[model samples]
Target chain A: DYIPEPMDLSLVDLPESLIQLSERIAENVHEVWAKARIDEGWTYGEKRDDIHKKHPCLVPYDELPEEEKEADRNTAMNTIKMVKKLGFRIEKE
Target chain B: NKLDYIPEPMDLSLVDLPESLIQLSERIAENVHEVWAKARIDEGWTYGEKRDDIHKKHPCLVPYDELPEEEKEADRNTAMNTIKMVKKLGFRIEKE
Candidate 1:
């Protein structure tokens, strides 16, 4: 696949306010989804966890077990690399 | 509160219009907003100063549940239903 490289942040000069506004909008979008219960009964926070927590490869891509490919699967790992991030793991019997 | 996904009733006409239903909806909205406001101020995380490490306050997740003799029986309905929905959606329990 001819994937264009990701944007180079060094060349981009987005304003701080715009960054904040973007974050606000992202939160609002999540909120709207929560209200509608579109996919499931996940709240804004739950959905956030769904999006952010855990890693496709389990561990950090570089650190993933050999069986797990060690880094860079279909997606990247969570920014906060914790085996168990709070508010996301719902273990059912 | 994010009202985007709240599983609205099939019949719009069936929607609650009374003080009780209205109050329940209001409470849901309040809780949503409260969670959002706190998270916004706290780096997009709002578990309060202390969320029980057990599921981070497992049984204590919701406040009204802490109240005695209040639909405690129906609470599992949501959890069970969500997991049901997740599994039905082909959500795998364990990470692949």
Candidate 2:
């Protein structure tokens, strides 16, 4: 078992409870972004040809590959949960 | 132009946390901190090392507790929501 370290840690060992919450938040975030991005004519992997070669999502939410969607949600939820522990709160709208 | 949000003053000190949550939170905090800190200091999350500068330049890279009130709003609400979820999952956050 991995001990919790304040300065070093890995996401592979996050508690299952937090992982569940992170996934939920991530899915919601994707749903919102998918609508906005598709409306703006962005795609799943469309390249912007910029310095960073940014690629907007070409596929809409329903058409997005399962793994692609999961990846996005995972990243988003991880960040959200991280800051949440750090005292960041999502203000009520 | 829309009016910007205003935040209330807050106490910036850390408090003694429940033993269980203290442990859980620390585990969660370490992982989150590692990812964010790397992104901020090393610019390591870049897309192929030359792109994604926008994310690399995020202005909110400061320590969590040091965040301004307005910026802290979402994270504040997030914990309240998390606490609610944990309660439903049978984890109590009662004052002892």
Candidate 3:
């Protein structure tokens, strides 16, 4: 486990534009997921109480329509970006 | 409005949050992002696959340093704004 020590995110010079972009992307991702959860018949309190049980979209991840898949990847990449900014790495194993 | 985690516009100005409960909302949000990111890493996700399919692909997981700045921005912004949103809502999450 010879991993590089985490870069202090607080010390890193992050651009406001980049951060703003992420906020926009993340919001879209969250909203998409949340909406899907509702569309897939999530009961009141179903999503809020259990993250695992939450299914924003009911289809196979890839089987989703193009618009949906594009939306999905957009959020995924953004989430990855955000994780990295916090000094956490997503490795390619 | 119809999005997930979309905060509804509430009149918090008229709502009074108890001091003891103010931190709970933020704490839950912070934990959610950390646990989520950690779980994804542990599950072997990296910057290659479209990630449309969960747990059904060759994941090329890389260390945090290897991730590009933009990828890093995504998670950080989500966490930052999410935590603040919860705090604003005055929703308390007491850790079990």
Best by DockQ: 2
Question: Candidate 2 lDDT, tens digit per residue, B1-96?
Answer: 454212221221333334554435434543554455455466333323233455654444555554456545544433333444434433334332
Task: Quote the true-contact fraction of every model.
Answer: 0.02, 0.05, 0.00
* Model 3 alpha-carbon miss at residue A80, Å: 18
Candidate 3 lDDT, tens digit per residue, B42-79? 66653444443445332224454444566555544444
How close is each model in CA RMSD to the real structure? 20.7, 11.5, 15.7
lDDT (Cα, tens digit) per residue for candidate 1, span B2-39: 43333222122332222332323323333333332333
Q: Residue B42 in model 3: shift from native, Å? A: 5.7
Q: What fraction of the true Cα-Cα contacts (under 8 Å, chains A to B) does candidate 1 also have?
A: 0.02
Error of 1 at B75 (Å): 2.7
Q: Which candidate gets the maximum TM-score versus the true structure?
A: 2
Candidates 1 and 3 compared: the better one by TM-score is 3
Those runs of model 3 whose alpha carbons end farther than 4 Å from true positions after fitting are A1-29, A32-93, B1-55, B58-60, B91-96
Candidate 2 runs further than 4 Å off: A1-25, A29-93, B1-34, B44-56, B79-96
Between prediction 2 and prediction 3, the one with superior TM-score is 2
lDDT of 3 at A56: 37
Please rank every candidate by DockQ, starting with the best.
2, 3, 1
